Design a protein around this ligand. Structure first.
Ligand SMILES: *[C@@H]1O[C@H](CO)[C@@H](O[C@@H]2O[C@H](CO)[C@@H](O)[C@H](O)[C@H]2NC(C)=O)[C@H](O)[C@H]1NC(C)=O
Ligand SMILES: *[C@@H]1O[C@H](CO)[C@@H](O[C@@H]2O[C@H](CO)[C@@H](O)[C@H](O)[C@H]2NC(C)=O)[C@H](O)[C@H]1NC(C)=O
Ligand SMILES: *[C@@H]1O[C@H](CO)[C@@H](O[C@@H]2O[C@H](CO)[C@@H](O)[C@H](O)[C@H]2NC(C)=O)[C@H](O)[C@H]1NC(C)=O
Ligand SMILES: *[C@@H]1O[C@H](CO)[C@@H](O[C@@H]2O[C@H](CO)[C@@H](O)[C@H](O)[C@H]2NC(C)=O)[C@H](O)[C@H]1NC(C)=O
Ligand SMILES: *[C@@H]1O[C@H](CO)[C@@H](O[C@@H]2O[C@H](CO)[C@@H](O)[C@H](O)[C@H]2NC(C)=O)[C@H](O)[C@H]1NC(C)=O
Ligand SMILES: *[C@@H]1O[C@H](CO)[C@@H](O[C@@H]2O[C@H](CO)[C@@H](O)[C@H](O)[C@H]2NC(C)=O)[C@H](O)[C@H]1NC(C)=O
Ligand SMILES: *[C@@H]1O[C@H](CO)[C@@H](O[C@@H]2O[C@H](CO)[C@@H](O)[C@H](O)[C@H]2NC(C)=O)[C@H](O)[C@H]1NC(C)=O
Ligand SMILES: *[C@@H]1O[C@H](CO)[C@@H](O[C@@H]2O[C@H](CO)[C@@H](O)[C@H](O)[C@H]2NC(C)=O)[C@H](O)[C@H]1NC(C)=O
Ligand SMILES: *[C@@H]1O[C@H](CO)[C@@H](O)[C@H](O)[C@H]1NC(C)=O
Ligand SMILES: *[C@@H]1O[C@H](CO)[C@@H](O)[C@H](O)[C@H]1NC(C)=O
Lengths: 120, 117, 147, 49
């Protein structure tokens, strides 16, 4: 009788007590509850999140290109994640671009070197 | 490869052209401060592979031929610094018919005005 | 993190990138060679949504994925779709074709492709005149190697 | 080091002198098309330091 994976999407309980539930293996039903905001993603049926048309960077990865976030009253939104700004290079067979100035950047890189030594 | 040297590996030590790095000790780890050179404020120019002067192709020794619309210069690739094209900036290789994109300009000679005196 | 678009008309000194640049005729914005690659590797299951009504019956015992799901073993879908990975690779191709290596170090600075090849010939100890004098032969060799 | 640059590391990106590489996406993986310069048609000469 039992079948199908279930994931619950939450902002921190410190922030809210709303949740959205993802029913992979359901094509919107075998759901715990349904209401408004039923959205069918390729990872399953997402219930409890409002689907928007914008695209943002990922906040909570849902899968198959969909992310969720808690944005503004407040609510949980689901969207297609944005890969970055669309750009274009003005290429031609005789045009070049030469930098006339520069920046001195200083970036940080953190690497673990050791872990805790333990005895039992 | 980044504190004890300068790395040419792309993105191995910071994004940009690596200058140097500084190690800092963190708990159970290490922090590198990668100093890189990032080019800025680009500007468009017209360019050309070679240059015909006397029925010979002239290629730049180091750098590229650029023109500001009317006058042709040779500049280094990562910083705009135009200079007058000269037989010191360039080298010759063959005649003109072979290179596609070759451009007609004059190639100055530093000796020519002097020895006549 | 910049999605560079492919230049409209391809004038790359005789170098042909049609086989590896994204193809709009196809539903996926995948190149020709990427499709050859995706037809070679066969996966256990495509879609990640197998419904209960599909596994209902003896199809449960017959299908392997149904037998896995009825025992609590789930396969989670990846976060990036294959179309998104294809957009990333097309951005990398459009950046490396039109700007050389400059787009990896900062802003992409355009440069004619044959001039970039001359740079790279310098990079291995061959004077750029060699490239400019064998431009057509080198482009043909590259094209046949891609083919 | 091979799509975003030109590598001098021997045999890191193809056999030969690396010119450039092109990434292609495969299922669960990545395919690199390494373009290298391979010298051909050698000829003997007499040399001197
Ligand atoms: C959920 O079900 C619908 C139909 O019940 C699926 O949409 C169909 O997808 C197939 C792909 O082979 C098309 O041939 C049909 O024409 C589509 N039907 C409709 C009504 O558009 C949908 O793909 C299923 N959802 C998922 C993500 O599996
Ligand atoms: C290169 O960029 C620097 C900025 O990093 C420019 O220096 C600035 O110059 C303006 C006036 O020209 C000052 O108001 C700023 O305070 C300067 N900034 C710093 C940090 O010194 C510099 O002029 C630029 N060079 C070129 C070629 O334009
Ligand atoms: C170099 O030249 C290109 C082509 O003119 C410039 O790119 C264009 O910028 C305008 C805005 O003024 C856009 O409307 C065009 O769509 C851009 N591209 C094309 C294809 O024309 C570019 O800004 C110039 N770069 C610099 C630094 O001057
Ligand atoms: C391109 O650069 C050259 C050299 O910088 C410019 O020519 C000079 O322009 C200045 C300003 O009028 C004159 O005082 C010099 O005598 C000029 N030199 C010569 C020999 O012509 C030229 O004007 C620039 N062209 C453009 C259109 O930017
Ligand atoms: C750069 O490209 C332009 C066009 O994209 C080339 O201009 C052509 O030049 C030939 C000369 O034989 C003419 O017959 C064509 O009519 C021109 N095309 C157009 C539409 O202007 C130009 O020659 C190319 N330059 C290089 C570097 O090869
Ligand atoms: C660049 O200069 C060369 C020679 O200085 C030009 O070639 C001449 O072109 C004319 C007209 O096509 C011919 O009658 C001459 O016989 C050519 N001379 C030689 C020796 O080739 C060439 O046309 C110039 N290029 C441009 C576009 O101005
Ligand atoms: C790049 O290569 C493709 C093939 O790999 C060329 O497409 C061929 O074009 C010829 C004539 O235009 C046709 O007869 C073939 O049937 C085409 N093959 C395919 C599969 O498309 C394409 O023309 C080449 N690009 C350039 C600019 O030459
Ligand atoms: C360079 O010189 C060597 C020595 O003559 C050549 O190697 C010989 O080739 C012949 C075939 O004609 C063999 O029978 C010999 O055994 C080879 N080695 C020796 C030790 O003599 C070599 O072919 C020449 N390379 C080129 C490219 O001309
Ligand atoms: C999270 O918890 C802290 C301390 O409990 C609280 O100060 C903060 O307001 C909480 N965050 C939100 C947005 O409610
Ligand atoms: C998103 O866009 C589609 C078509 O572009 C439209 O049908 C749909 O109503 C839009 N959704 C929202 C939330 O407005």
């Amino acid at each position: 009788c039992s079948f199908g994976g279930v994931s619950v999407i939450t902002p921190g309980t410190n922030t809210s007590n709303q949740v959205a539930v993802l029913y992979q293996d359901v094509n919107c039903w075998r759901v715990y509850s349904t209401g408004s905001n039923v959205f069918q993603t390729r990872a399953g049926c997402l219930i409890g999140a409002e689907h928007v048309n914008n695209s943002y960077e990922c906040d909570i990865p849902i899968g198959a290109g969909i992310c969720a976030s808690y944005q503004t009253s407040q609510s949980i939104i689901a969207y297609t994640m944005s890969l970055g700004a669309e750009n274009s290079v003005a290429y031609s067979n005789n045009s070049i671009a030469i930098p006339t100035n520069f920046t001195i950047s200083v970036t940080t890189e953190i690497l673990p070197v050791s872990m805790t030594k333990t005895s039992v | 490869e980044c504190v004890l040297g300068q790395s040419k590996r792309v993105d191995f030590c910071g994004k940009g052209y690596h200058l140097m790095s500084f190690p800092q000790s963190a708990p159970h780890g290490v922090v590198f401060l990668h100093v890189t050179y990032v080019p800025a404020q680009e500007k468009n120019f017209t360019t050309a592979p070679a240059i015909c002067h006397d029925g010979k192709a002239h290629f730049p020794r180091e750098g590229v031929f650029v023109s500001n619309g009317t006058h042709w210069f040779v500049t280094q690739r990562n910083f705009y610094e135009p200079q007058i094209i000269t037989t010191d900036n360039t080298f010759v290789s063959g005649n003109c018919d072979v290179v596609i994109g070759i451009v007609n300009n004059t190639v100055y000679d530093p000796l020519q005005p002097e020895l006549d005196s | 993190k910049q999605i560079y678009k492919t230049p409209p008309i391809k004038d790359f000194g005789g170098f042909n990138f049609s086989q590896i640049l994204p193809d709009p005729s196809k539903p996926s914005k995948r190149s020709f060679i990427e499709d050859l690659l995706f037809n070679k590797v066969t996966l256990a299951d495509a879609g990640f949504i197998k419904q209960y009504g599909d596994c209902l019956g003896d199809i449960a015992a017959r299908d392997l994925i149904c037998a896995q799901k009825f025992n609590g073993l789930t396969v989670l879908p990846p976060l990036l779709t294959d179309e998104m990975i294809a957009q990333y690779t097309s951005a990398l191709l459009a950046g490396t074709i039109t700007s050389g290596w400059t787009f990896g170090a900062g802003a992409a600075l355009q440069i004619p492709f044959a001039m970039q090849m001359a740079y790279r010939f310098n990079g291995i100890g061959v004077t750029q005149n060699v490239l400019y004098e064998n431009q057509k032969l080198i482009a043909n060799q590259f094209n046949s190697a891609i083919g």
